[PDB]
Amino acid sequence: SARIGEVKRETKETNVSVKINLDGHGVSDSSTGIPFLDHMLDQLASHGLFDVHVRATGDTHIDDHHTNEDVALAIGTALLKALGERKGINRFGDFTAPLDEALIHVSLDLSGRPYLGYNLEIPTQRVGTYDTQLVEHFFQSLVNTSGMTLHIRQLAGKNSHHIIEATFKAFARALRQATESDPRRGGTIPSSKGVLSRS
Amino acid sequence: SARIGEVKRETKETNVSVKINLDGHGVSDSSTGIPFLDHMLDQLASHGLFDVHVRATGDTHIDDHHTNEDVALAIGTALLKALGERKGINRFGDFTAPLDEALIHVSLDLSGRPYLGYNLEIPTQRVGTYDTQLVEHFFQSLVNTSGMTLHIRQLAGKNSHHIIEATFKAFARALRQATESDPRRGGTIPSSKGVLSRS
Amino acid sequence: SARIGEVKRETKETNVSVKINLDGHGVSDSSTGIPFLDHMLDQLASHGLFDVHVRATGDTHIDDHHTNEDVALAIGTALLKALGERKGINRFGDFTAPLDEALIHVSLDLSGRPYLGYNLEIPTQRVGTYDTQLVEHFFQSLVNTSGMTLHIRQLAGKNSHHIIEATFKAFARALRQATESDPRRGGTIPSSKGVLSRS
Amino acid sequence: SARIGEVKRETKETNVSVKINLDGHGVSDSSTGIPFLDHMLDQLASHGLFDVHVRATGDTHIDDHHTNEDVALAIGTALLKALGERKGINRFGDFTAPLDEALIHVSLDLSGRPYLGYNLEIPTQRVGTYDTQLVEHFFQSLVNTSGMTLHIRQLAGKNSHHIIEATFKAFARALRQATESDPRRGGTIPSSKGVLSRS
Amino acid sequence: SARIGEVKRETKETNVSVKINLDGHGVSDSSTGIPFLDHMLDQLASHGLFDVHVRATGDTHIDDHHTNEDVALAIGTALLKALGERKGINRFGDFTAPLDEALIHVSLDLSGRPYLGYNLEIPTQRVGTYDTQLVEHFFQSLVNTSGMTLHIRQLAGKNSHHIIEATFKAFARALRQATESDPRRGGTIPSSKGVLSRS
Amino acid sequence: SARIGEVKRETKETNVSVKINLDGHGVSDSSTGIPFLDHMLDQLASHGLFDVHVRATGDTHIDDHHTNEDVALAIGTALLKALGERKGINRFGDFTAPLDEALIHVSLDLSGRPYLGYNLEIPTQRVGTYDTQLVEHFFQSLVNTSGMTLHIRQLAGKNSHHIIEATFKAFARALRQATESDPRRGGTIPSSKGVLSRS
Numbered sequence A, B, C, D, E, F: 001s002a003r004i005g006e007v008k009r010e011t012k013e014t015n016v017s018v019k020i021n022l023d024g025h026g027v028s029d030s031s032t033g034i035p036f037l038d039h040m041l042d043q044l045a046s047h048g049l050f051d052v053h054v055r056a057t058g059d060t061h062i063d064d065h066h067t068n069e070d071v072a073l074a075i076g077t078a079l080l081k082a083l084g085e086r087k088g089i090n091r092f093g094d095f096t097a098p099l100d101e102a103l104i105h106v107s108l109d110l111s112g113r114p115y116l117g118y119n120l121e122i123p124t125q126r127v128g129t130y131d132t133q134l135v136e137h138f139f140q141s142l143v144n145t146s147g148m149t150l151h152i153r154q155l156a157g158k159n160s161h162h163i164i165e166a167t168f169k170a171f172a173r174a175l176r177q178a179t180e181s182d183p184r185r186g187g188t189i190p191s192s193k194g195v196l197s198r199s
């Protein structure tokens, strides 16, 4: 059966609902209140083949920050739930994607241990109305609740939209690879220590 | 059916014919008038599993330049023709190949948008009789007519033949990956915008 | 008869229509959804004497990016269509235009071979609401579909609007020159190789 | 039938036995007298899906060095034996694996030509009781007898155990890829020169 | 009547014949024994609209040098002869031409005073079989016998053939401009001192 | 009896035959298709007193590279075969040879463990028609199949032929020394570990 994770998360700042199918067909269904983020989440669906359902509202008159963070936190938890015990999966993903002059390498391990390595240098402060500092925060928050080791490396790029979008494409492909079935491992846990856990 | 692209292109400088099968079995059939380039195109076939048929004549007494360029232009157009609407493909390719001390990373996106990122530093001017400046020009011309985003990164290397040949091997494997069927996407166009085009 | 090129181009991101007359009288008729870009396209008409008809709509709530790019792509294709075989033209254009303290050199060759050389350093991120990174992208996309070799050199300038507008004025005058009839060449193709092509 | 290589190797310094199944199920069975190395060889099995059987004894009161080297030499020979003529294989492997803050890229070519490129900078001298200089020597010795071109690149890392273990995970995945069947090449030798050899 | 200059020049090193029509139709008829130089002289005809007739033989087994120089000297003298008293001409020419990534500015004054300013940095030693040092020498020798002030400035470029060919295109267009009739000056000498002379 | 090693090695690129007598009288009999390499192999015979018989043909129209490499590989294997168990030999060789201003130190150990240390800086790209990058590759390939530890150090030199030829003279004398009988060791294996092996 398809691996589906669902999360609802409300604070005084934001209200978020997420449903992710790891075994999806690339259904894009994201409405966060942050249009640029929606476009990025569409890459996650289109290139990762995840079914991505996201709804969020929040205090965007203060900053897109809280919405951005809370969407990411909920996506991470949805991934954690969908992944379960992580039996039989590839576990590791590794992909470098361009978008024109931009080139972004993403490597990840569905380890249970959160870590973000990130070196993007996005040369403008706003892409549309979206604060480009929020890209790093999206990935940091997602790693923290998913229990993912994630490295994002900027190999080339100048246009801020190209840099960010190449990142989401590379991430989508790496995460697709990591979450997919390993055809040789016979459903075993892919760890020498016998378990993968966020604790 | 196999995706085959064919091009014939004649100017006062050169005369070129190309036929490429994306769904080939690695048939190597290149005769450009530039022996080193023929050897490189053989890697494209051997490692990419393309069937590669190339014939060229031209003004090599002036320079290998025009022949090299026109072969590349025609190969790019043949790729464009064979790819068609680009439905159902992986779209992205990413591979790093060594040849002894040389190590070359190639990442590409069959986007419809031409771009070459290239940082090779080939330490000699002639490999056999082949002018090593012509390597960059081969890839630039190929991207321009294929509508490919292509990045070529030199990670290591000293011997010029090793550097160039590792590049063609990495390119061949990345292009193979990008052109192959995506087994999960059900024949859809791999783009959130609904189309991939060179225009 | 006047050389007119027309393009219609729709994706899930944008919808664009362009009509350009190379042999125009400077009719300015641009409405892209990006007011600053409209003002720049008016320079193309006023100084280049092109008739410039552009309509675009698109996802500007995400970013002006996709609209900007798609307008440029369509303009490039319209230029390509209008130019045809490029018989009898000057082919090359070269002009440096000031706007107050700004001074921008544009040189171009209607070669069939796309290339952008660009060194502008625009010191602010937004001119009005227009993201100044999008200037480079406009010219890159236009070159890619027109098959133009284009160099843009910033010789002086501080005010971002002056820098960008001087660029469009210099480009307009260089493109006017290149597209105009060469009064001495008797309708021949202006190339030693006997043809000019985007392939 | 499964590709299995077996080696027994005794000197006045060490006594080593190795059996490797390239077509394994990740059976981990390593006892070298060097506990840290055993843990690393377990990654080779767990992530590479090799069946790895190693026994060694030796002069560890002098140094772990001779044991470490002789284990590596014998593993390399076992790989060479199991690989045979190298018909029908992918030949090339390329993978970047993290372990928390560490990130290690491994690229290899089962060429028949030994070469190690290695740039790890392991910041401590002993991980447990294991001398960290011995990591480079393990890979160098393994390449020398297997006839492998191998590049190991440290992209990030601080903790010595993380750096070394990420290396073994990346190596395991790259070697798995290279040794696996190429589903399209019809059992042919993956070389334009018609043979792959250690001589 | 058309302004035609003819020169025959023989030494123990070379034998050269040149005929140039300033008021030509771009007839290309150059055979120097140096194929790359022939291709460059074809640009002079194609883009300058000069009729260019050149024949040379010489000691190319020693070096292309003497032939290259003697062709240039004879072309310069042919230009001087064709120009005569220089009445009614534009006198000055100024053009910047690209060839792909190369961009070369040429400015010249048909002053009667020889001078070459030249800053090309051609990154390879041989383009085909042609020694790239000989480019500077071609222009220096041509200026010396024509009595031309000539500046050649490399603004961009990497490929040696592109750099050199862009130079010849820019030179051709600048020389065309300078040699053409000034439509407003009523056949007067374009000099405040009342004469233009090589002495 | 004399220690003689013989190798025949054919690929789609090259065809090579080698016979080496370690206990020779300096018979020079090398014809590789690379005249400069033949002259170098003559030093190996003249100064090393090896009998050196080499025949090669190959794809020199592509590059001398494959021939050069394959000759070296076969020489290394011939040395390995002739050396056998390496009983009773000096094992180590060490010699510094000049050729005029050039001075090259070679130290080697017939260890069974391949390694090349090399720091030559050959200031020209072609000596005759021979690509000077191929010198390093000759020694690397020879070490790889012979199981030799080899260090080559440039102490002085400017003329490329002098540098390369001094290298071959020093190598010849060092290899002669290493392969010769140790008059005191009574036919024992010259190793504390009781064996010398390439595995």
Ligand SMILES: O=P(O)(O)C[C@@H](O)Cn1cncn1
Residues within 6 Å of the ligand: A111, A190, A191, A192, A193, D099, D161, D162, D165
């Ligand atoms: O959890 P796994 O499968 O990655 C195996 C562990 O030994 C990794 N590890 C973490 N810190 C030191 N080693």
Ligand SMILES: O=P(O)(O)C[C@@H](O)Cn1cncn1
Residues within 6 Å of the ligand: A099, A161, A162, A165, B111, B190, B191, B192, B193, C065, C066, C069
């Ligand atoms: O064409 P695709 O599938 O890569 C999706 C586009 O949004 C990419 N893009 C290009 N410039 C800015 N975004």
Ligand SMILES: O=P(O)(O)C[C@@H](O)Cn1cncn1
Residues within 6 Å of the ligand: B065, B066, B069, C111, C190, C191, C192, C193, E099, E161, E162, E165
């Ligand atoms: O196409 P044209 O008219 O500019 C003439 C070509 O020879 C130019 N060229 C491009 N690369 C090397 N030469």
Ligand SMILES: O=P(O)(O)C[C@@H](O)Cn1cncn1
Residues within 6 Å of the ligand: B099, B161, B162, B165, D111, D190, D191, D192, D193, F065, F066, F069
């Ligand atoms: O052996 P392969 O399949 O990698 C093909 C050879 O041409 C490679 N090569 C090694 N040195 C120069 N070229």
Ligand SMILES: O=P(O)(O)C[C@@H](O)Cn1cncn1
Residues within 6 Å of the ligand: E111, E190, E191, E192, E193
């Ligand atoms: O010969 P012309 O027409 O350029 C006018 C001269 O005054 C130029 N000049 C040369 N040196 C100083 N002035």
Ligand SMILES: O=P(O)(O)C[C@@H](O)Cn1cncn1
Residues within 6 Å of the ligand: D065, D066, D069, F111, F190, F191, F192, F193
């Ligand atoms: O093989 P031999 O005769 O040189 C003796 C070995 O102990 C050498 N060695 C290699 N690595 C560490 N020690």
Ligand SMILES: [Mn+2]
Residues within 6 Å of the ligand: A065, A069, A137
């Ligand atoms: Mn926060």
Ligand SMILES: [Mn+2]
Residues within 6 Å of the ligand: A039, A161, A165, C066
């Ligand atoms: Mn986008």
Ligand SMILES: [Mn+2]
Residues within 6 Å of the ligand: B065, B069, B137, E100, E162
């Ligand atoms: Mn070119």
Ligand SMILES: [Mn+2]
Residues within 6 Å of the ligand: B039, B161, B165, F066
């Ligand atoms: Mn090769």
Ligand SMILES: [Mn+2]
Residues within 6 Å of the ligand: A100, A162, C065, C069, C137
């Ligand atoms: Mn874009």
Ligand SMILES: [Mn+2]
Residues within 6 Å of the ligand: C039, C161, C165
């Ligand atoms: Mn204005």
Ligand SMILES: [Mn+2]
Residues within 6 Å of the ligand: D065, D069, D137
């Ligand atoms: Mn050792």
Ligand SMILES: [Mn+2]
Residues within 6 Å of the ligand: D039, D161, D165
């Ligand atoms: Mn561990």
Ligand SMILES: [Mn+2]
Residues within 6 Å of the ligand: E065, E069, E137
């Ligand atoms: Mn001279």
Ligand SMILES: [Mn+2]
Residues within 6 Å of the ligand: B066, E039, E161, E165
């Ligand atoms: Mn040319």
